[PDB]
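Exercise 7. Given the components listed, write out the predicted structure of the assembled complex. Treat all entries as one system.
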Amino acid sequence: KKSPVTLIGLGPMGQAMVRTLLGQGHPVTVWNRTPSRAEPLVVEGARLAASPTEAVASSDLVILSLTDYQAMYDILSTAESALAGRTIVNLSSDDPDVTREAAKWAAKHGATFIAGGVMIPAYVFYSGPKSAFDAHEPVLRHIGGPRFLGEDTGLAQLYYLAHLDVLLTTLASVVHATALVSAAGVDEAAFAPEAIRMVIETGQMLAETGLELARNLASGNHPGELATAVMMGATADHIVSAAKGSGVDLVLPEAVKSLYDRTVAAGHGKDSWTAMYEIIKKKA
Amino acid sequence: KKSPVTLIGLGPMGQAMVRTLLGQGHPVTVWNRTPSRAEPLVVEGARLAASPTEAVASSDLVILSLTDYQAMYDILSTAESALAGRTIVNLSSDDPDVTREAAKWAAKHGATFIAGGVMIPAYVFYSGPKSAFDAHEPVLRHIGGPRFLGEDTGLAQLYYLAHLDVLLTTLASVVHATALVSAAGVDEAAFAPEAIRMVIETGQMLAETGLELARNLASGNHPGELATAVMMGATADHIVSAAKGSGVDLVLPEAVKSLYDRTVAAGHGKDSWTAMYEIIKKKA
Ligand SMILES: [Cl-]
Ligand SMILES: [Cl-]
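Answer.
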């Protein structure tokens, strides 16, 4: 009685989504480039499709969890005539303009398209036609906490990549800070927990520095308080010189130094450190 | 009956340290390039020194809280003959090799030298001769939680700058992620709190990903688990292409992409993301 679901892409994320959906009573048809990974899901109740075409034809809702959008094009190439009237929910990560081009390709073949972005703490960003999201939300809510962002298909991966922008850059800074200290002979195991704690401290500081951040970026006014761009720029300069003397790779701290240098050179030296937003943001 | 203290540099940090030390019964002699900032401390009980020489001569312990080490050289230039037999505790931020050169200059003028690094959540890194730290620890503990790091003078600013390496890079990523989303017309006030929450989530993830981080960096083995360098590198590539299409500044995500590119090109693609440490760390 529950609506059938097709899921293509049986990596770790797809495996968990199939198990979840089966436990909620949905018939799940699966397909994967290597059918061996489908075997555990078949014994849990899923049906292995004979081909991508038969997988697509088995449901009105086709969920894709692949490495990138090119994998969607390659897999569904032989199934394009079977896409008419169905909804594609692509949870794969890719460039936002790539996902927008996919919406045009989906419409060419008569399909509705929703882009998704999955965050494992789970919650999923969704973007595309709201009527399509509302039609499949009873199924999508079992995968994780749905957050509809808007009717621009590209939004889900834009938000996802911006979150990963924070994650990947922050993780890189922990590795870089550890190399900086360990260059002096300090045991990595001694300082790495401190660099980790600095992330937590940074988060809690951002839990009046956050009010400074959200207010300044939105209002466009960066009042120089306790932490100005010229003060932070001098610290960034010291980090670079320390890394240059330690023999530690420079590209990451030089990027931070580049942001503060251009922020000071633009006349925002006495303003808050948040004034680097005026250097980073989109022109005009 | 409490030991006298001299403190030079009456910015915000110096103001709080003087008030703290006075409240604990220590006579405090102060000096500043602009004597006006000493007036509030004088009414609290501090004595304004007539000159840097008289400030130095007033105590065996001289604490410096200036913008950089060059300010120490400039201020104490006329007081160099009065430094003999006293301990300089410099809490100013600067390059670690600059602080090591200061230890040589301090010994030239017969003074003991300790470098400090002040973290405002307060706790202070200290480095230099342990006998000097132990001799002044009863006074230093009132300033904040003392953490002796070792007898290399340069350690305190190395640890301090590595902590600030994490802080400044993480803060830059929050501003950059917000610009990435706001380039599409999203209100900054809508996404900036989400970018902030991503820092907190990153910290809590680092509170088995941390065991992965500390173990891999110290042992030098990066077993590829759920998050490999080739997977993270593809996400870094997407962030760059998204920023390149949004018109958002590229230097920060290109630095992260550069780290993953070289990590994959070095044969660590299947290893954990922590394998970028082998690209960042000091040669040999
Ligand atoms: Cl976009
Ligand atoms: Cl060093």
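Discussion: Strands of chain B lie at 5-8, 28-31, 47-48, 61-64, 87-90, 112-119, 123-127, 145-150. Residues 155-182 of chain B form the longest helix (28 residues).
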